[PDB]
Design a protein around this ligand. Sequence first.
Ligand code: XO8
Ligand code: XO8
Ligand code: ADP
Ligand code: ADP
Ligand code: ADP
Ligand code: ADP
Lengths: 555, 555
Amino acid sequence: ESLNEVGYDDIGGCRKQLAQIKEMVELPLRHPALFKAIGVKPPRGILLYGPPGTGKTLIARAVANETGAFFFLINGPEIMSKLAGESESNLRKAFEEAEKNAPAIIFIDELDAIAPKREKTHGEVERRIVSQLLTLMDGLKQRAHVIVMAATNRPNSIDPALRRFGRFDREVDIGIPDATGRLEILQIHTKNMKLADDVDLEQVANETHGHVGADLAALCSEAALQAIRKKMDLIDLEDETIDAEVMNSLAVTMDDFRWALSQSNPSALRETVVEVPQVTWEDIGGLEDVKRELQELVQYPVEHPDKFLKFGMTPSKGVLFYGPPGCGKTLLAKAIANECQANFISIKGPELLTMWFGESEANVREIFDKARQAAPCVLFFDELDSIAKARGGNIGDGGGAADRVINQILTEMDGMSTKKNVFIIGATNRPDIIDPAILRPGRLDQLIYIPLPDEKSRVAILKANLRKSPVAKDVDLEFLAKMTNGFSGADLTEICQRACKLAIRESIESEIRRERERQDPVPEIRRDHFEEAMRFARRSVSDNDIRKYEMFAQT
Amino acid sequence: ESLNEVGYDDIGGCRKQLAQIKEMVELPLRHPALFKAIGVKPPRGILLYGPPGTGKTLIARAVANETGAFFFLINGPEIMSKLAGESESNLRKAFEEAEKNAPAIIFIDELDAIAPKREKTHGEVERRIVSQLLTLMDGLKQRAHVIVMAATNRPNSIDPALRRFGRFDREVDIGIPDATGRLEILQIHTKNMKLADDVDLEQVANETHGHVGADLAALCSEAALQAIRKKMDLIDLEDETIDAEVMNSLAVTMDDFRWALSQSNPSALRETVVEVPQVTWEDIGGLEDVKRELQELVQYPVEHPDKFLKFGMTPSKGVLFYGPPGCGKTLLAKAIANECQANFISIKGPELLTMWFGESEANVREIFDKARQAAPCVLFFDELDSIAKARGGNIGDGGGAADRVINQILTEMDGMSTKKNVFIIGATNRPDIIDPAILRPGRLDQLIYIPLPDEKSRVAILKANLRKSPVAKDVDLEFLAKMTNGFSGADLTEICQRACKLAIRESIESEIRRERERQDPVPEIRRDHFEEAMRFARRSVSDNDIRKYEMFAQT
Ligand SMILES: C[C@@H]1CN(C(=O)Cn2ncc(-c3cc(F)c(OCc4nnc(SC5CCCCC5)n4-c4cccnc4)cc3F)n2)C[C@H](C)O1
Ligand SMILES: C[C@@H]1CN(C(=O)Cn2ncc(-c3cc(F)c(OCc4nnc(SC5CCCCC5)n4-c4cccnc4)cc3F)n2)C[C@H](C)O1
Ligand SMILES: Nc1ncnc2c1ncn2[C@@H]1O[C@H](COP(=O)(O)OP(=O)(O)O)[C@@H](O)[C@H]1O
Ligand SMILES: Nc1ncnc2c1ncn2[C@@H]1O[C@H](COP(=O)(O)OP(=O)(O)O)[C@@H](O)[C@H]1O
Ligand SMILES: Nc1ncnc2c1ncn2[C@@H]1O[C@H](COP(=O)(O)OP(=O)(O)O)[C@@H](O)[C@H]1O
Ligand SMILES: Nc1ncnc2c1ncn2[C@@H]1O[C@H](COP(=O)(O)OP(=O)(O)O)[C@@H](O)[C@H]1O
């Protein structure tokens, strides 16, 4: 029991949301004698939600065991899997036992089974359970201490009748650990194990992009199992290989981790992921003027709210970055979030276009909701033009300047204009085609013209992109940028990448030669590799698009 | 019990509808001895409806406890959650007990559960309950006093068989508290609590736009809990921190309220909200001629109905404001409602276009119904052009001058021509593209040409928009407007906003400088800021659109 027990230390990598859950159900359970009636009624509707496997059960077990309670697990498909007439009996038994003990936490796991969407529970026998749960929750009002948590996979699957007020109304999120938190999950899941040095858990966490909770645990599991396999030749003692002699002389190495990290851990979950971006303004060369104009709207108004009130001005929410493709718009919108700690819930052009092509416009209403429950966040809708481009060309050419997605967005953004925590960044590459209504007061107002990087900006961005990689001495990333006068951002980066390719070849080539001669030559990128890469370099976004975007500078 | 009891004072912020409910079920319950047969049969079908959480249960408890009765709560999903054969037994038991006592109110909460739409209750066992309820209601006819209220989330979810006459036929609304009523809800929910001064509940209510009832209660709850948290360092006495010494020295501050107001109260409900607008004709500079022509049709005909009868003229319902984009059309239609107390149920262009793109034309029939139950109201359909614009350009270009939304509107408006309380204001920005049938007698008739603000109008509107904000002395908003001769409304406002931005920077900049020098400079907007803002100012709606709209002046 104690070997795999739970606590506030076992749960790791998700502290922002664990803080909310704790502070919700730790003060009214550790110090409930004040009863909260001196203040307000305590929470009674916690509805932890997240993708299958994120620590939802572990979080509840930690918040229960740590703050002494009477955790009574009511695993979802076990009250609905006990014939007819016994589901209600078991629910009432569990809740009456919970209230019998003064402190209590009732963790209804997989609430989608007990309480699905009401239009999907055709069977009436499965509907009596939902209604009984609703009435029992209503009866929990003013009952001693019956704080009840739920473990729905997604909050939209639960019956809305449960998600009202008095019932579940404290919907907290438990998102996918983006980075630097999944490393913590791996640390807690590996402290009992033996890491055989060279185990850069930081790199393992950085590589995993989508793995949630038990998936990272299974990654570590397969790493340990691969360590065992590599000794299988030494463990091949059919009788008694189980002896500790061939066991304790084992520990996971970097390659053992990698084998499962890349190949044998295909299981993963992909979706809109809230993430505190790692890129910083130091990583963005140039763009000083916009860097200043992007502080007047998201860092200064929040740092001095009183000044924006006495004078009187609704802060301009909804900057609409418009510039040549690949000019740091995404990098800028991630670095701003890095400055002011926030969640960069991005919605790229493919994700927006999938709803117009698939006619699934309702999903948009969830995106903003995901932003509503992840505040303070950013809503970098990238390539708003995509829907109109698919519809045709200039001025649509297949109808008007509207669509089935950016029209719903025009309503959700208006609704979110009340929320004073969520910025709505748009990054249309071609601005003369977006719906004009997304440029009106209240909605997206400010138009920051991310310019084509100027020569100084080219030098700065080339230096920034050549930071994590060796750059050598005579490379001279000063005149190298001067040869480029209209290159559009990424392309310059590509050049650098191309160099790091056109260079690495030589290295690895020499490497194989070092093998033939056996039967590192200037690792840093030399000017020869950069010249060879520039030999095939393209000025993406011809001057036509540059002057077209300048044509939108009139607005 | 008495601590959280209910009465006509506990319910607050919704008095217009509470008045109807009271007057319906207060005279036939407090003085029923006349039996109403001396007059007419009393109401027997109250069907309180509103978004989940608005005081629906509190309103019933107030109207029951205050006017002594026998409130017998029949919470929806508790008669349908008691096996088979006991639902009808419980309903009959409750109603027979209600009639046993002379006075009685039966508050069927969440009627959607007991009585859903008949096409969604596939299970027959859930259909016997609806039919039993219908028959029992029919038997309540001439029964002593069995006034029965319902708490459906939305009246369309209930079976129409219940909404007929003799059965539920007194469908009253309980809408989202718009403003100045939610402040009252907060006051009632905070009187027992301690507001630590500086708690501008007016501002808190003004900020919340969509919060309903229990959501504002939860806002206050989280404010109090945050006040407790801020003392957590002082409340950190694991043994006996519950002592009143560390409690009574607490009270909610402005920042504690704000933390939940902006960040930690994401829960909210958004929909078409009936609201008595706050903008007044004093806030609209210029537009005198239309201000007079907009009194001949909504204030004079209702102030002197007899004159419009003897002479003989159906008052022209359906003004169709047509002018350059952003020229006070919405402001005018809100100020008119502010003058004659009404409900400004607005339907913006995105909300109209969402039905054409989504092919959900039936929803229109609800909008007018929402207007029918919110009379006297206004129906400011903004940007009727939007649907045609999405369909193409001039004269449609993708077919005819019709559509799937403005065609249904052409029928609902004809049906509503009988209702002598609801004005139907249209605000198409481009008028040469709306369906011609919306310009015919009976339907929208009058065409008020909101003109491009003239120089005097520019001065007036600039002065009005610079009212809530400091304006200084030498700013001289007289020649400042003279430099603008074709600016279209909002743009001038934007200039002012731009100034209040281009000014505030300096202030906050000086502020941070005041910090560096430590290791307000002319707060009022100076002419320098206005000049800088005008340096980047655009004449929205070029003269082409002006002369195009003048081309529609021929009609
Ligand atoms: C009668 C009344 C009077 N009345 C007024 O007089 C006007 N008024 N009174 C108060 C404000 C106000 C509004 C804000 F929205 C705000 O922002 C705080 C904030 N917190 N976190 C972030 S995001 C942060 C940065 C990046 C994203 C992730 C983290 N922001 C932020 C900053 C800038 C823009 N958008 C959000 C602060 C404010 F003071 N306006 C109101 C009404 C018209 O009528
Ligand atoms: C044989 C018969 C003879 N016959 C007639 O001879 C003609 N006739 N007899 C009576 C009327 C009449 C009609 C009205 F519609 C009316 O309006 C009252 C009203 N109350 N509230 C508001 S809205 C108010 C303002 C803003 C919105 C929110 C609050 N209005 C209002 C005002 C102006 C326009 N629309 C509604 C008053 C009337 F007298 N016409 C009728 C028939 C053809 O055949
Ligand atoms: N955030 C986390 N921290 C530590 N362990 C986790 C986390 N998330 C998931 N796990 C691991 O995944 C397993 C199952 O957790 P989870 O799937 O969240 O609960 P449930 O299976 O009840 O949904 C546990 O054994 C736990 O060790
Ligand atoms: N300082 C910088 N300025 C501009 N671009 C940069 C900078 N640093 C890196 N980049 C590159 O610019 C690209 C930006 O692409 P992005 O603007 O997101 O494209 P899109 O706007 O089409 O989504 C990135 O792929 C990144 O590699
Ligand atoms: N108009 C209102 N005035 C005062 N309190 C309200 C109002 N609306 C909601 N509430 C609060 O919300 C809680 C639940 O009310 P409500 O949701 O309307 O009833 P029900 O939960 O039966 O639908 C109550 O405790 C009450 O204090
Ligand atoms: N007195 C006034 N006259 C004209 N416009 C004003 C006045 N006062 C404020 N405004 C501004 O004019 C705008 C009106 O926009 P609106 O006509 O609703 O646009 P649309 O017609 O496209 O819906 C508002 O945003 C408001 O800020």
